[PDB]
Symmetry: C2
Subunit: 361 residues, 2 copies
């Protein structure tokens, strides 16, 4: 079962809902008219439509079409996007961007020629997201304690939204946070960030962050989160097992420069190949990706080290296909990639240090 895939090749429809400040509708349109060109020239943009609500003049929609998820995902979290859309900050109060894959189309009163005949991804109401950031050389142990010992927020956001799990990891000065949320991601994260237990930990970390932010200014906050976002590009669920040990691991891949998007595509293909013909202790696998940052979050039955290739997603030809995309000798792993002892040592070095795994209903 693959429930999330950003590699199916489907065309992408993005719904960006904007909330304009009371009375600044003329300034918003003026500011869009100045930045439209830059947005349209983004590699992968096909079409756009700026619309105002017939029910509320503060409600605006920017719907866009992209060739595939990859061009959009590369620009949405880009610093070029942030600089392109910064003169809307005077006139825009909030934004909500939903992203979808096109399955069916009707044009000319008739299904469109080229309409996909793809099948729906089956699944439950869960959204997965990852955050990654760096802390100052010399602050690693302090940051690890802070995040391992925070007061968990109330998972209850609403009838619609609930936090289901938050898993934190560390490798060197890099922290990765992954969450499972029922319902809307933005609503959940905003409820979580307003809780005293979490806002305290955030105020204690700011002094350690390699990039400095002011949770005070929504603009320094949005830029950190745009720069920290690690979208889930693949989720595959596997048949359950009857083992007495269960373990969640985070695997940070030593990627060569420019190879991150390609490692993520290899890892996604491998994970979907395992789902079609299951073999191994993996119970679920999520690929999180931002540039040359590739993380695989794996739930495993039994000892992960009894089955390195299947946990690493480098079963069969993957290990060979990954040698070209990975710098294993930068983390000290020499040896032919398919060999059993090489994959066992790669699992040990790329496994992130678990900090806290908090499960909520």
């Amino acid at each position: 079962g693959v429930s999330i895939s950003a590699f199916d090749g489907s065309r992408v429809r993005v719904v960006l809902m904007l909330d304009v400040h009371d009375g600044m509708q003329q300034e918003f349109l003026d500011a869009y008219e100045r930045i439209r060109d830059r947005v349209a020239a983004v590699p992968g943009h096909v079409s756009d439509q700026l619309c105002q609500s017939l029910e509320n003049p503060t409600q605006w929609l920017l719907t866009s079409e992209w060739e595939s998820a990859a061009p959009f995902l590369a620009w949405v979290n880009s610093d070029e996007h942030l600089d392109t859309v910064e003169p809307l900050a005077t006139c825009v109060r909030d934004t909500h961007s939903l992203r979808y894959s096109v399955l069916r189309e009707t044009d000319g009163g008739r299904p469109a020629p080229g309409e996909p005949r793809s099948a729906p991804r089956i699944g439950d109401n869960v959204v997965r997201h990852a955050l990654t950031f760096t802390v100052r050389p010399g602050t690693e142990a302090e940051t690890a304690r802070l995040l391992s010992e925070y007061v968990s927020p109330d998972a209850h956001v609403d009838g619609s939204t609930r936090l289901l799990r938050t898993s934190l990891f560390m490798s060197g000065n890099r922290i990765v946070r992954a969450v499972e949320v029922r319902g809307d991601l933005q609503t959940a994260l905003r409820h979580v960030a307003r809780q005293p237990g979490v806002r305290a930990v955030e105020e204690a970390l700011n002094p350690y962050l390699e990039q400095d932010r002011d949770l005070g200014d929504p603009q320094s906050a949005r830029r950190f989160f745009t720069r920290a976002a690690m979208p889930a590009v693949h989720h595959a669920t596997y048949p359950d097992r009857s083992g007495a040990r269960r373990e969640r691991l985070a695997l940070l891949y030593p990627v060569r420069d420019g190879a991150g998007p390609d490692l993520a595509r290899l890892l996604a293909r491998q994970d979907a190949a395992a789902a079609r013909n299951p073999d191994g202790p993996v119970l679920a696998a999520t690929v999180f990706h931002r540039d040359d940052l590739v993380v695989r979050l794996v739930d495993v039955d039994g000892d992960p080290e009894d089955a390195p290739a299947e946990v690493l997603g480098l079963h069969g030809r993957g290990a060979a296909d990954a040698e070209r995309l990975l710098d294993a000798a930068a983390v000290g792993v020499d040896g032919s990639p398919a060999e059993a002892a090489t994959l066992s040592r790669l699992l040990r070095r790329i496994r992130m240090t678990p900090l806290t795994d908090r499960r909520s209903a």
Copy 2:
């Protein structure tokens, strides 16, 4: 100062967020493949896109382009909309529809050739919506008491949505309920409906409703509100007037059976043209229109009966442009239009009986 206008003739982009039941995605796609034609064969329907979320398999998008607002409103509010989408409640847990008028388009890497050069509507993050329904002849006075003395609900829904004003009115056996909401109308109405105070009054209404409602069935209720819906097709804000008296009135226009769409577009042009060369005691006017039911909700500085033409939106030639459109005979209004004595007596006859006007802390 016109904040809502459904008659600017712009085309409509509709986003319909669907939340599918967990695991029922294949059945949902198959349910849609067996209803897609009907949607295409709607007049005014131009294009459509069915999309599944990259972040959640149970989140889906139906986005469509419509010729203008009129054909869309005619359809979403219709009974055959509800019947066309009937066999999907088995795989759909919830929907949320948002309607926008398109203002700028980019096709190619180019600003679209036929893109609107229209300027934006200016306003203050308020949604306005009305509902109309009728009670069985003999239940009018019993209904008025209930609707006037019910217990108001928490105007607070969440930190982004709040109920601002609820105003109820009766005329004959017709009730009109208008609301002003900050933020999201669907969330606001669902919060209010779930409140104890208003469920109690709603249960004690159903023995009087000419129309059958079983809010016990989520469908029978959706039916009722779809049928009762009276959308705000126009809203204008006028400069504030010093004034020690401020009054809110609902004008229920007597329309010639044939058509009242044109009466709404007339009261709308006149409201928008008074919104530009404001000269009278009106501070704001919202036009509500379902079919031949036309209601103007007016905020007046001072005595409404001292400037009845401007309160009726029949200043200048409107009253004569409306003569053909109105049945002032059936209400007891004989006279020359464009004339005070008749306009004054029309205001007195079409003005609905105010039952309650609950202004919220917001």
